[PDB]
């Protein structure tokens, strides 16, 4: 009737709570590692950024964005989808590369024709150099990265281990390095293949950086979301428990009365 339907549902809320507790704990384990990884990657990047500034690097765009293959990371997917959406108003034609299963869906609805290359995305472990290098290698052929003047990367910066701000950075192309002073305060040769190689190396290093930063925010975010869910399901377990009790009590009285009318007649 009402009673069993309360009861079957009360077990649902109960089981959902347990699962969100479990999820938050596996997030914590992974999150430790992820952070470890992001520091070494960002650390390499900085030494590079020391070159780029001092060189005064300057100067279409490519968009890369980064998600897992798993949903329920809170609003990382759609804050990222959104901040991608803004940079389609500042380049109403830009070619979106979606690294991850989740971001891929959101953008593809908005324009199917901007979506040009997409991947299967990053797994249930921290981003890694091998992956980014190889995707970079494919990038050169399909998207013809070297003609473009800009390439651009989007991610989520894990500001705090309770917060996330979507942030971006600029991967410097092959054109830039060449015409920025590099004989003027740095010493290069015309018999160096260093610009066409330096472009590729920072395509992949910078992209590794970004990936790491987004992935860390994501794994931090799921912990936060799923914690708030444990509490939300709990508030609802307690509310269905009050109904469950009331409901059993009425059934007992209604059962009783049937006997009484019978005995009496």
């Amino acid at each position: 009737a009402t009673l069993k339907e309360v009861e079957m549902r009360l077990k649902s809320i109960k089981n959902i709570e347990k699962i969100t507790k479990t999820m938050k704990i596996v997030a914590s384990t992974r999150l430790s590692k992820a952070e470890k990884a992001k520091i070494s990657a960002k650390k390499m990047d900085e030494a590079e950024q020391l070159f780029y500034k001092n060189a005064e690097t300057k100067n279409k765009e490519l968009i890369v964005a980064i998600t897992s293959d798993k949903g329920l990371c809170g609003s990382i997917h759609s804050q990222l989808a959104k901040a991608v959406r803004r940079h389609l108003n500042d380049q109403p034609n830009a070619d979106i590369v979606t690294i991850g299963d989740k971001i891929k869906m959101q953008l593809l609805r908005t324009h199917p024709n901007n979506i040009k290359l997409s991947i299967n995305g990053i797994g249930k472990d921290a981003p890694t150099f091998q992956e980014s290098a190889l995707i970079a290698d494919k990038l050169l052929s399909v998207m013809k990265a070297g003609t473009y003047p800009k390439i651009s990367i989007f991610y989520n910066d894990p500001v705090s281990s309770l917060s996330f701000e979507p942030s971006e950075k600029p991967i410097f192309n092959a054109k830039t390095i060449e015409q920025s002073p590099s004989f003027g305060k740095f010493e290069i040769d015309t018999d160096a293949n260093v610009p066409r190689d330096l472009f590729e190396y920072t395509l992949a290093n910078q992209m590794l950086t970004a990936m790491a930063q987004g992935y860390a925010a994501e794994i931090s975010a799921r912990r936060n979301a799923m914690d708030n869910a444990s509490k939300n399901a709990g508030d609802m377990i307690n509310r269905y428990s009050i109904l469950y009790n009331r409901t059993r009590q009425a059934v007992i009285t209604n059962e009783l009365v049937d006997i009484i009318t019978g005995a009496s007649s």
Partner: protein
């Protein structure tokens, strides 16, 4: 559709359906959120909240609770107000601009209040 007119019936179908979607998702919205539910469905939920606030209509003998005098709105006028809103031609103003208002014109006029 052959009694009260077809338009009326089409609107009425949509009003039950959009609202049935918002009822289905009630567990999932409270436990989780809206960026954890599908984008089409999220829209239906905002839209259904607009419909739900709209039911707020100032009344004559419930003037004390509404706090605003009575509103007589035609059936024919009513079909148009809900028809446009379902097509999201009046979702570009607050979901509280639909609270305690009579006709459609009034819905527009409260957003201009609210923005201030």
């Amino acid at each position: 559709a052959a009694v009260v007119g077809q338009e009326h019936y089409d609107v009425a179908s949509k009003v039950q359906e959009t609202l049935q979607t918002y009822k289905s998702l009630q567990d999932i919205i409270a436990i989780l959120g809206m960026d954890e539910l599908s984008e089409q469905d999220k829209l239906t939920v905002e839209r259904a909240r607009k419909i739900q606030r709209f039911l707020s209509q100032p009344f004559a003998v419930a003037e004390v609770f509404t706090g605003i005098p009575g509103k007589l709105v035609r059936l024919k006028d009513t079909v148009a107000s809900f028809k446009a809103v379902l097509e999201g031609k009046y979702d570009n103003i607050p979901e509280h601009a639909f609270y305690m208002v009579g006709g459609i014109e009034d819905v527009v006029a409260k957003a201009e209040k609210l923005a201030a």
